[model samples]
Target: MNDHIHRVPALTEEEIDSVAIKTFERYALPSKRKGKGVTILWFRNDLRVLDNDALYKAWSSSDTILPVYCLDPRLFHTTHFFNFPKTGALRGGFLMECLVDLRKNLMKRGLNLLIRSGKPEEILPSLAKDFGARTVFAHKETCSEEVDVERLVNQGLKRVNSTKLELIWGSTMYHKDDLPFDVFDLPDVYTQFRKSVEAKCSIRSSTRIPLSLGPTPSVDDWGDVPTLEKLGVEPQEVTRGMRFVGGESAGVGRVFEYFWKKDLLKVYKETRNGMLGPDYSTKFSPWLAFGCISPRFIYEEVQRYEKERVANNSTYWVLFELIWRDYFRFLSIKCGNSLFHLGGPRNVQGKWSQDQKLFESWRDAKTGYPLIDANMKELSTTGFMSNRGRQIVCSFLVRDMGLDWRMGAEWFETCLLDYDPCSNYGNWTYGAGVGNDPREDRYFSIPKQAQNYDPEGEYVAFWLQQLRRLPKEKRHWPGRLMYMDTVVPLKH
Candidate 1:
């Protein structure tokens, strides 16, 4: 029964084409092109042209369009409590690259991106009025901060008479409109939600735009894409692991490389749990987070692979991961601000410490436990951490250290290249035993996890160079070292 639940029926060629045609019909402007005025394409998270719902609508609705990205100042501010830079060096650098790539892609088809550093609510409204744009089209976002910004943008548009902000759902694998249950009535349990959606919903096909978008309207000044230093972020050099190049091109290239050139998807289920190197997993999170690549595009590719190549747990597991991504997003919609609350969505209450010292120790990679320290170090330097490592470290922080989970989540928000609010906070809340977990107290035995995933201790040794002299057995639990003592005694 579980196996059957995972199996998605393959679409026939005609059925697949029909899906595309239907999507085009739904979003495509009328043949007459009734809205002759310039339309503003507000490039938010949905950065790519292909499979973009709002971009497609903007393109179809107007004769001349303005593609704009606002580098909102609020995003660069400090985290709510911890004061960590909300967008850290790594993510900031990646974002600049994503914008650069978007500009390049748009220019190739005769449109130029207007980059500016200001609040979108302020900048977008001014642009709408100045460019005679009747509507500003963008992909919608979930969490409080993003939603609030959208509200402001809408108000601003309204203030500028005859203008409106048009938001479209394009973030998740399964469209929000096509969900089996209404978002307000979404199942609290992930498995329950996943099963229902898998049983009931069919994923919509990704949209495609014409090769040439025609010329963008004449403007006096199309602002330059800002550099990291210009954005008040320190320049970070990638010294180890994958040097992720941001943009739609790199994102698409990675998918093709992972699924076709490397054939890693064939064994994704087996190696996804490994802690070291990029090949162990698909590494699609960063791309997916920024909307440089669409989940639907990835889904279509996975289906093509299943039809042309092999269909097994590995192949199906990719889709399974995507479903998990969708589940978190939907869960966010249902829970709203509670998703970030102390008690989380389930409202599990308990005493949680906010010891800055312990948090600093954890953040600085001085946790003493080699596995925890190594993973933290990797995250600090690379802006990326393995899935297994994230779970283990999060467990140690919440379960063993008894710290406020938000501190850790905020830190992740600061550093992660793939920091999407739904996944980051949702996963943290689950790990902290405050969210949707059925089990009230879910703890990871760090040593056992290290032994299983990094049996040879190579991952630990790689990150903690001082511990390189220690034997493989000692790498995980070094008796003595030039390291801070464990912040709290190991539960195991």
Candidate 2:
């Protein structure tokens, strides 16, 4: 019954390079430009060409387009309160792979992606002046740090009367304009927001780009894609867990593998809580975070699958998760800086500890609770964690250890491959009981969770080899036999 879906072979790197070079040679001359000045496609989180609103608009409006990606130094600097590296090695490495694949994709379309290392506000203005470009187009971000950068870029562009920065909304599943209610008046409860949108709003169709975009402006040098070490972060290799190769090709390939090849979408709701293997969940978050795949694109594919295959709660659940992603983004717009404050959007006055010793114990995987330790180890090693693992760990840090929630949030920001400001902070605030939860005390029981989710202790054994030799029953409670002590006594 699933006969409609089939795998198509991807282009080899050599083949892509050859075709791109030939296209560039054919259209690189200045004579190709019309009276309309060149437009700069300033790439940020939205990395892919397919279904990209900003890229589509730039190509349609300009005769010649220059695509650029800036690796800002500030992003690599240490975080504000905790001194953790802002971008960890694993994420930095994944970003490099994304850039490499993005360049190859652009080359196929008869354009080159210009790489640069500097502040975007400074770089974009200088590039615009050099090429006589009037407008820079990019996807908009909601958080304060990103918004500040956009403001600076706008100010920088004002020096030249004609040059300006234009931003478009392209991140979430539901377009901002299509929302039934105003963002400022968004419902505090997620269920209310989801219900309103499901009843009134419809997802917009994805933007389509032309097969071949015109050539980039002539320049002597396009900067190289930097290495993790060059960016002042240690280089890391994936010795365990899923090896997530970054790019549009890999992202789309993953969707095909999970939905069609594996037929896993039929049971997504049931298996989404799984912790051990890659197939248990659709590992779309990392790709989604970097903009390798669009949420609406995933939604369209689900509609097609429902027509050809079986339609069930499992299939609908994937879209449900996407709606949660949209809710966080919209909530960010409503709350603004309050989301990052110690007392969150609700501003609940709760005392929180800033204990360095307890925090280090949790971070280093010495918490002695097999579930917490194993999940933290997986995160530090792979730059990824199961959704279930995330909820458990966040609760352990906030409710169990009674530590500052921002520390946990910042560490996640540094470590997670799928780090988006809205989701990371939004969830943290919820875990700390200072967010939008109607109920007080959103706590998780460690032993109860271990029994319900990982009954055999196979997930723990996989991460904690020392406990492998112990009996299945002993693995979850090794401290009874004096194996290792927990960082803090379990409260529940």
Candidate 3:
């Protein structure tokens, strides 16, 4: 029903990639059956109700369902070395806004979004059994621990025989069956994959929002929702002039305005390299990270817009960017546990370091490198950054700061409001000369980058306090300056 849709250009790297389908062999998943009192919608990353496959499946087959999202404790606990809590301050703040929005939508439609805290494997089955639910629905999430958790939950449900679990792939535009090549035959390089798929495959038609988006039981609506304090964190102060909100409404509004009203997506190519300002990009990463809007929906809209009047490289660039996002996710999936290692999925041997002091300085944006420091500061303060800037700063850290790649990746996990595991680590690995990175790392010479991206030094000056007053050219790099206060003395 949705053919002739516009397909965007490919933007990510060229690498062999695939996903895990070994549900029975690797995961030890138990039997799945349905026939009981209530249905449980176990919310994961795919939060929105509209265009949801799993939700529709559950609603169709159930009498009454309770929708729930859990705030896992494991996310709050920072790990040793570099495994900081997955949900950092800015991301948590963004997530809270999304949850609030989701709750509001549910309430408007005579339902509620139950929020709780604990492990899914531990909490989900118990919640289902407590409500006498016979089936659980959730979007299939791929990761070492997340997959394991899904397996455990499914296994538990089998033991009790009270509930069953259904995991569906609800992330990408192209469904598995729609892909051009078989998993094993998929192209090894990104460009090859993109070009081939662009010609052969097409994005599947998106599922429509059901007329009656099944309501949560009236008596048993929401679980106890945790406060900011219960989550054990103070509300973070957002940066001045930057107020990005979370949730479906805001994310959808952005997509609409970006293409139709603002027309920013029309010229995304020209300004995508911009260091500052809102017009730099679509700014969809944060929203996409949480599944507020589906890439398939966006694709459909982009095509419609193109047919009506708004077609161009810029318009198509959005799809290009998304391909990059998907490419990284699949890269992470194909590589498995190795994706997190320093040298990357392939683990290229490099003389990596663990200078605690140096790493700490970089973390706090005191690396004595203004380009690097400014980007780091913006991320710390705002939980977002331009993709161009994100790419450059990451390169500077690996090339100039000489710290472990994992440190930057961990920092992003803690700081980025829209940080998705697959893309975050995937990009970090490329910048660090891992994965499908060039033969030599993307050694983004700091000075060269300053000249190209931040020519006026506006961005560098904006976040770097000490370098703000320096002249345009001089403000761009503090390390080369003779007299000004150097970047926190580079702390060992």
TM-score per model over all chains = 0.92, 0.92, 0.87
Of 1 and 3, the candidate ahead on TM-score is: 1
User: What does candidate 2's lDDT look like per residue over 385-448, in tens digits?
Assistant: 8888888898999889999889999999999989999999988877777887654347888998
In lDDT terms, how accurate is model 1?
Answer: 0.83
Candidate 1 clashes: the total is: 0
Ranking by TM-score: 2, 1, 3
Clashes of each: 0, 0, 3
Best candidate, lDDT-wise?
2
Candidate 3 residue 153 C-alpha distance from true site, Å: 0.9
Clashing pairs in 3: 14-189, 14-190, 15-190
lDDT of 1 by residue, 1-492 (tens): 222111011233344334434433443333333456789999888777778889778877888889999998888899987789989998988898889878877886689999988999999999989878878999898988999999999998888778878898888989999998899989878888889999999999877676667568899888898877777888987666556777776777677767876788989999999988778888889989999888898988898898988889999999999998998998898889888888998888777899989999999998788899989988988789999999988998888788899999999999999999999998888888787665434778888898999998998988888778878888777775455577678872
TM-score for candidate 3, residues paired by index: 0.87
